[PDB]
Amino acid sequence: MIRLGLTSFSEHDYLTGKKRSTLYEYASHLPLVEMDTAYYGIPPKERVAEWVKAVPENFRFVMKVYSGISCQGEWQTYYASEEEMITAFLESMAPLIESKKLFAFLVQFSGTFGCTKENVAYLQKIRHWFKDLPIAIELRNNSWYQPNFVKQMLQFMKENQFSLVIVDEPQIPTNPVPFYPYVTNPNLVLFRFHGRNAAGWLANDAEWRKKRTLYHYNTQEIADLSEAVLKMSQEAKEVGVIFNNNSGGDAAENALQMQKVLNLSYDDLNPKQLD
């Protein structure tokens, strides 16, 4: 099975018709979402249970971990230890964990997170922090993908059962990772498309925040990306896909375009109308 999803469930009016949509409404169209809620602050267990209750049996969640864990944030800010930060996170996510609706905890690392002895150790630290949970590592630094590291890194990922996210980001003259279809964990793969707005990037441009995921994958690009998704589904059990190119609002459209190209069905929630 191949699950196509989007980041955020409320901001996809193409998918649902309404400007702000509910998770229930969302899960009447796709069987997958990424949620970056916890990234900015670990939510209460009760609200995580609201999400679980709002979706089908077949539905899955890509849950982005707290920035304190992926190192953009600081554990010190609200927690007395790195250990207690994880404890807080896992206690918050228990409802999602126990429900079997977790696709994987996404651990997106900064662009500055490069291939060093420390960082490799930290990746092992994360393995230990998330006992036997599905962890998806998104590297955004081509240093890991250099000829002298690639093969040993991929091996590292396999050993630690890490599902290395397959990333399609704009190939800016910095350190963007390549679109490298490869299954590190056969039990689950994760694609993440951020658009290819290479043109539109300027050095020292603050608006790159908005432009970096402003893209409408054309009919050709979707065909090529689909072929990759399909090729990894041969080598993997679960295969997740998250379209993140939504600065223009194109995410939902491009995802359903791929659904057609991959020819996929649905057993989601259902519609109604009253209030």
- Chain-centroid distance of CA 167 in Å reads 10
| Residue ranges of the binding site for Zn(2+) | 25, 29, 128, 216
> Does the protein bind a second copy through residue 22 (CB under 8 A)?
no
CA dist., res. 207 & res. 151, Å (int):
35
Could you tell me the smallest distance in angstroms from the CB atom of residue 78 to a second copy? 5
Shortest separation between residue 232's beta carbon and a second copy, angstroms: 30
By CB under 8 A, the residues from 170 to 189 that bind a second copy are none
Q: Which positions from 137 through 166 interact with a second copy, judged by CB under 8 A?
A: none
Q: Does 79 bind a second copy (CB under 8 A)?
A: yes
87 binds a second copy (CB under 8 A): yes
Counting contacts by CB under 8 A, is residue 111 touching a second copy? yes
209 lies in the binding site for a second copy (CB under 8 A): yes
Select from 20-28, 68-76, 117-125, 142-150 the region that touches a second copy (CB under 8 A). 68-76
50 contacts a second copy (rule: CB under 8 A): no
Phi, psi dihedrals of residue 104, rounded to the nearest 5°: -175, 150
> What is the closest distance, in whole angstroms, from the C-beta atom of residue 203 to a second copy in the complex?
5
**Span from 48-56, 104-112, 240-248, 254-262 in contact with a second copy (CB under 8 A):** 104-112
Q: Is 204 in the site for a second copy (CB under 8 A)?
A: yes
Q: What are phi and psi of 13, to 5 degrees?
A: -70, -25
206 makes contact with a second copy (CB under 8 A) = yes
Listing DSSP states for 215-270 in one string gives: ----HHHHHHHHHHHHHHHTT-SEEEEEE---SSS-HHHHHHHHHHHHT-------
CA-to-CA dists, residue 219 to 59, 87, 110, 216, angstroms: 27, 45, 31, 9
SS3 (DSSP) at 85: helix
- As a whole number of Å, the CA-based R_g of the chain is 18
Residue 88 in contact with a second copy, rule: CB under 8 A: yes
**In this structure, what DSSP letter does residue 42 have?**
P
CA angle, 64 then 41 then 48, to 5° = 65
Among candidate residues 201, 226, 245, 261, the one with its CA nearest the CA of residue 8 = 245
Applying CB under 8 A, among 18, 22, 77, 178 the residue interacting with a second copy is: 77
Question: Is residue 249 involved in binding a second copy (CB under 8 A)?
Answer: no
Of positions 127, 171, 208, 262, contacts a second copy by CB under 8 A: 208
Interface stretch with a second copy, choices 51-59, 109-117, 222-230, 233-241 (CB under 8 A)? 109-117
Q: How many residues are present in the chain?
A: 275
Using rule CB under 8 A, residue 122 touches a second copy: no
Q: Are 196 and 179 in contact (CB under 8 A)?
A: no
By beta-carbon proximity to a second copy, the closer residue of 76 and 155 is 76
Amino acid at 62: V
Interacting residues with a second copy (CB under 8 A): 41-44, 72, 74, 76-80, 84-85, 87-88, 92, 110-112, 203-209
